């Protein structure tokens, strides 16, 4: 029996079957509920709209994300999201299939315990597991060693792993990721005329950065160039045909990853956070971690986030290290791909929490590989 | 470490300054378990350990289990990922490095000092653990006075008051003549 692999990230549900090379279902983790009075007796009766069913049908809805910074904040909406994942998108009876869920490292024990409660008691799932997403990104990278800068919609976290031993004390986590970059670009655009301000307008600015934004290789020189010249001013066309011209903030958005002070956040950037996570490691492994900075998850998709990462780590690393950033094209799904790997391995079929074990041992069993 | 263990509960302390809230959370709530695996079993069994603290903005944080798991890191450094003997093994191993003829008097005088020895039950836990290491006839005595928090300073006030000490000052003239090597007078 194929397992599900179900990377419910903060931004997109990515769900599929183990041993398949990409998710079938990829749709945003949004539940919209209508913010306006229904008058057409017939279709306005649908109480709420889930995922891609609600990113269209968008301007009528207040769009709520159930997961924020990798923590599930609303559970009735996450049961909606998962109900739609199994019975409308994947069309699988979850009574039938094991379920490899994932979550970020360093987040509340209540999230694994509620996810597992819901899987065992609402969806009756026969067995399940809850993998750390940056471990999955290594299974997806086909290597046992590396520091995974898994950066998502909710969270950026480094998990350094060496020869298959994670070093939990070196795991960094930032609550700084594509959603804080969305809400930042949504402000920087108001330095030009454009006031994106509601949810749903959040989804326009999201698509504006998922399209136009790129990482400056040398931020102060791109700022000097964009102040000098119109040569950066790509333009985008809003859902109503207004043309938005962007230019300077095209690269200032993802700079927030390297200068979190822009989003007002007291933190090292992702380059300093990756390097500081390597320095937390044993000196004897740092050569191999420096040679294997796997990147994964969507906000590592910005053009030039590798190369900028490499330039910055190479400025931090001690001048003889082969700083290599591994940013495959599929990195966008690497957490899921690695979950498909993991759930396919024969050595893994013992790791499922079976529902019998959850009933006998109680909810402590779910923290098997805790981080 | 406590700043991480608190994120097993809901609480994400993460910046500096939030470091100072978690510092005050351990300088208040945390205590050393006398028998860590039994305190873990008790805290998993019962809410009876769940002291709560009120953050600078009036949110109430409930702590409980990690109330004692924080200073356990002194006795199990592997928690903070650190390859080391705990402070009990490190004290005992430091006594075993000594000449056998002095170990009776070192075992009878484990002075404790400085702030992280202030956890409730860090003595007694220290005594229990050294007494498990020490060879069953030694008077393992842990000296943990109330003022231990400042004992380094108090002892510096002693030292700088002694008449026998007034020759030990590096005078600026001597530093100018001998250069910076003079400062290592009692090097360690």
């Amino acid at each position: 029996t194929t397992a599900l692999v179900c990377d419910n990230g903060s931004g997109l549900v990515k769900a599929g079957f183990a041993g398949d090379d990409a998710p079938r279902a990829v749709f945003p983790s949004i539940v919209g509920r209508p913010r306006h009075q229904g008058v057409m007796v017939g279709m306005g009766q649908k109480d709420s709209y889930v995922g891609d069913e609600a990113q269209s049908k968008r301007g009528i809805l207040t769009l709520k994300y159930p997961i924020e910074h990798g923590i599930i904040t609303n559970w009735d909406d996450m049961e909606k999201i998962w109900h739609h994942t199994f019975y409308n998108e994947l069309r699988v009876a979850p009574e039938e299939h094991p379920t490899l869920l994932t979550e970020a490292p360093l987040n509340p024990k209540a999230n694994r315990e509620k996810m597992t409660q819901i899987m065992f008691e609402t969806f009756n799932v026969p067995a399940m597991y809850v993998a750390i997403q940056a471990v999955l990104s290594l299974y997806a990278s086909g290597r046992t060693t590396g520091i995974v800068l898994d950066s998502g919609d909710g969270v950026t976290h480094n998990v350094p792993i060496y020869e298959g031993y994670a070093l939990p004390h070196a795991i960094m986590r930032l609550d700084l990721a594509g959603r804080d970059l969305t809400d930042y670009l949504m402000k920087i655009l108001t330095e030009r005329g454009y006031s994106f301000v509601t949810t749903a307008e959040r989804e326009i600015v999201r698509d504006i950065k998922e399209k136009l934004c790129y990482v400056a290789l040398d931020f102060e020189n791109e700022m000097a160039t964009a102040a000098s010249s119109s040569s950066l001013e790509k333009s985008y066309e809003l859902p109503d045909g207004q043309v938005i011209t962007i230019g300077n903030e095209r690269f200032r958005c993802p700079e927030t990853l390297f200068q979190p002070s822009f989003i007002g956040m007291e933190s090292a950037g992702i380059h300093e956070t990756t390097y500081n996570s390597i320095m937390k490691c044993d000196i004897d492994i740092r050569k191999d971690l420096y040679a294997n900075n796997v990147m994964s998850g969507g906000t590592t998709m910005y053009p030039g986030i590798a190369d900028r990462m490499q330039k910055e780590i190479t400025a931090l690393a001690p001048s003889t290290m082969k700083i290599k950033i591994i940013a495959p094209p599929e990195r966008k799904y690497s957490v899921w791909i690695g979950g498909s790997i993991l759930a396919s391995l024969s050595t893994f079929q013992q790791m499922w929490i079976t529902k019998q074990e959850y009933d006998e041992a109680g909810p402590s069993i779910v923290h098997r590989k805790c981080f | 470490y406590l700043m991480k263990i608190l994120t097993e509960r809901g609480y994400s302390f993460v910046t500096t300054a939030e470091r100072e809230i978690v510092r005050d959370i351990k300088e208040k709530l945390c205590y050393v378990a006398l028998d860590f695996e039994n305190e873990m079993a008790t805290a998993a069994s019962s809410s009876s350990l769940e002291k709560s603290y009120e953050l600078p903005d009036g949110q109430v944080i409930t702590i409980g289990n990690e109330r004692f798991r924080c200073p356990e890191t002194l006795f199990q450094p592997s928690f903070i990922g650190m390859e080391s003997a705990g402070i009990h093994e490190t004290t005992y191993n430091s006594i075993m490095k000594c000449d056998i003829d002095i170990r009776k008097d070192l075992y009878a005088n484990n002075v404790m000092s400085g702030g992280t020895t202030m956890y409730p039950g860090i003595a007694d836990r220290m005594q229990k653990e050294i007494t498990a290491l020490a060879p069953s006839t030694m008077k393992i005595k842990i000296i943990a006075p109330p003022e231990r928090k400042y004992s380094v300073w108090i002892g510096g006030s002693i030292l700088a008051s002694l008449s026998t000490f007034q020759q030990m000052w590096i005078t600026k003239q001597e530093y100018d003549e001998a250069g910076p090597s003079i400062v290592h007078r009692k090097c360690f």
Binding site: I67, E68, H69, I71, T73, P108, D175 | T7, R9, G10, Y11, S12, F13, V14, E18, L55, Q59, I61
Partner: peptide, 7 residues
């Protein structure tokens, strides 16, 4: 989160 941040 329960404290420290919004979630």
């Amino acid at each position: 989160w329960x404290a420290x941040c919004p979630a």
